């Protein structure tokens, strides 16, 4: 009874350590190094010590493995010690069963489940102690890091794991087979620039602002297009977009410059995700692209970006 | 004596502890291309490996429960054996000893050994670990219902994966950096875009501009040049009955001897409850920009153009935490 009281606290304390190391492992190895260096530049409390741990992901796995294993071993080495003193030789089992059922719930699975909901907030909190324990285990680290001269875990939620849950959607009907492809496209659609999908000026059909109104229809009805850029004595110099509908319903005296409208000029590095929205806000369809020198380069239509997101994807 | 019963279970548990740890690494380290090759080659333990990898979470919970249970058993028998010899100094002798044995033989050891022998070991352990996996089905059932977690969700217990659940996953992706902040707002947008139907983004019949198929082109151009549109439906003796669609780009480029019925083209009729995520792909595949919505009785109720759906997709997009 005397020592038993002192043993149930080490049992509880070791359980918290095992949970602390197990939950710390999930949050730490899940933050994208691209995002860690973002929090560090912002200077948030914990990012510096977190970028340190990311410098050697092998240090995050060994620390949490050893700190937890040591704890887990102590969590049960005492649970049976307490068990036997309470239940004789039947305590090695009783103490064993009541230990394995708590190392699983509060020292392994529970701590891992909790850390997934709060992964950025917890990673910044356990950056200091985990980096501290890693220093204490520098002997054991060098032992396992030195063998690296004699010949990585992934986050709880990977972009592939998400993609897979969507495929489950298509399979179960909750998600149309058409928007699975669109959901797949969005993920491969934010880092895309307009230059990657623009129509090179070479293949563009345009018209000079000095041309004849009637002569413009010769282009529309011959090329079948509905919107052609307009240029001013230089293919480089785009001064307006001409809409075919305006020419069909044109007055008897109007000229090319009367029915053209100011184009939305954009760079070659324009993200097409925000351009599909900027065009949808102007009620406009075409966007003129300019290179680094302001010279014409190509055009981009809402029909281009639409083709991107609607493109059909492969099923795994 | 009872000691002999303890030291034997101590080793056996230490082998299980190392069997699961090394089976987890080997089963997960192996690439999807290697399994597909072993699948076609048809080697022993491949078919059971292909299924075992379908849910990478089911592999970690079984190898964890296994390695954890065994590890505790290794420690239990050390604190017990040592206690039988060293009284209460055994709890320390057991803890300290077990703490090093599990680490070097149940954890770190089995892990490093698996990284170099991923192929051979995965096949020899795909069968036993898969067997255990089916025993853990009760645990896999509960885990797949706790939707506040994202660590152990096997998805092999037939869960209801609805738009709600995917959003939960995407929210986590943005928080850890695997998904960018901006490309999450897009997923939430298209996620709710699929819920929208045709009627909710259509133009009601009352606002539509049509032209009777018995009119003349001189009248057709007048409509376009007045309403500004580029396409208008066509009917026959009744407003409920739509028979085609007319485009100005063709009426302007119409032969001297032309008509409205020969210039119009068959429309794509759709119900009011039509999903626009499908219609957007279908309209984009038929090269057409406008559909025709028909109410339950197959009468003209409105139209849905590509632009009508892009507004719902873009300007009215969702985002939440
Ligand atoms: C809920 C579960 C709870 C289980 C138990 C959790 C135990 C947490 C472990 C506490 C470790 O405490 C840790 O000690 C070290 C040494 O001071 C601190 O690190 C310190 O080290 C450097 C120098 O080495 C000091 O200059 C500086 O004050 C501090 O960074 C660290 O900030 C703290 O985090
Ligand atoms: C589960 C049991 C695991 C084993 C227990 C741990 C045993 C640790 C034995 C290794 C001693 O650990 C470590 O050895 C190296 C020797 O090069 C020491 O480092 C020394 O060599 C390295 C280069 O290799 C130098 O960078 C460093 O400045 C020097 O101090 C280090 O100070 C010591 O901390
Ligand atoms: C120390 C390392 C410990 C290694 C022993 C692990 C336990 C042995 O694992 C054992 O493997 C065999 C296949 O190889 C499994 O066989 C299983 O697969 C077939 C599948 O058609 C089932 O029909 C069969 O009923 C089942 O026993 C068995 O269920 C499992 O109990
Ligand atoms: C850690 C501590 C562990 C605690 C608990 C251990 C094994 C018990 C459940 O066993 C499991 O039962 C369900 C049905 O009941 C089976 O399901 C199977 O048949 C049922 C039909 O009723 C269907 O759901 C489905 O076709 C199939 O999955 C499954 O194949 C089996 O694997
Ligand atoms: C931290 C994780 C802790 C995990 C704790 C594990 C608890 C195990 C005991 C609970 C087992 O839970 C029980 O398992 C069976 C599958 O075998 C479930 O499924 C069974 O019943 C449902 C209906 O409710 C049926 O649809 C299904 O076909 C059948 O297999 C059952 O609904 C659930 O009531
Ligand atoms: N004047 C143009 N010159 C060269 N290419 C063009 C021109 N206009 C559009 N395109 C190209 O056609 C592709 C599809 O664009 P889009 O379908 O919107 O033309 P459109 O048939 O006139 O459209 P709409 O009929 O809706 O007005 C674009 O990728 C673009 O590169
Ligand atoms: N005949 C029509 N009657 C009523 N609404 C129409 C008609 N045609 C199009 N609309 C509506 O106008 C809006 C925009 O559609 P849309 O952009 O396709 O027409 P458009 O601008 O004349 O064609 P385009 O832009 O390709 O030249 C949509 O809400 C659509 O429902
Ligand atoms: Mg077009
Ligand atoms: Mg082990
Ligand atoms: Mg329009």
Numbering used by the authors:
A (entry chain B): 4 to 154, 160 to 258, 263 to 328
B (entry chain A): 5 to 258, 263 to 329
Quoted from the paper:
CNNM/CorB proteins are a broadly conserved family of integral membrane proteins with close to 90,000 protein sequences known. Here, we determine the crystal structure of an archaeal CorB ortholog in two distinct conformations (apo and Mg2+-ATP-bound).
The final structure, consisting of chain A (residues 5–322) and chain B (residues 4–154 and 160–322), is refined to 3.25 Å with an R-free of 0.27. MtCorBΔC crystallizes as a homodimer with each protomer consisting of three distinct regions: a TMD, an acidic helical bundle (AHB), and a CBS-pair domain. Although MtCorB is present as a dimer, it does not show C2 symmetry. Overlaying the TMD of two polypeptide chains reveals asymmetry in the positions of the cytosolic domains, primarily due to differences in the linker between the TMD and AHB. The homodimeric TMD exists in an inward-facing conformation with dimerization predominantly formed by hydrophobic contacts of TM2 and TM3 of each protomer. Electrostatic surface potential analysis reveals a large, negatively charged cavity that has a maximum diameter of approximately 10 Å and is lined with conserved polar residues. A well-defined electron density is observed in the cavity, and the density was modeled as an Mg2+ ion based on the TpCorB structure. The Mg2+ is coordinated by hydroxyl groups of Ser21, Ser25, and Ser71; carboxyl group of Glu111; and the main-chain carbonyl groups of Ser21 and Gly110. A second conserved feature is a π-helical turn in TM3, in which the helix is composed of an i + 5 instead of i + 4 configurations, resulting in a bulge in the helix.
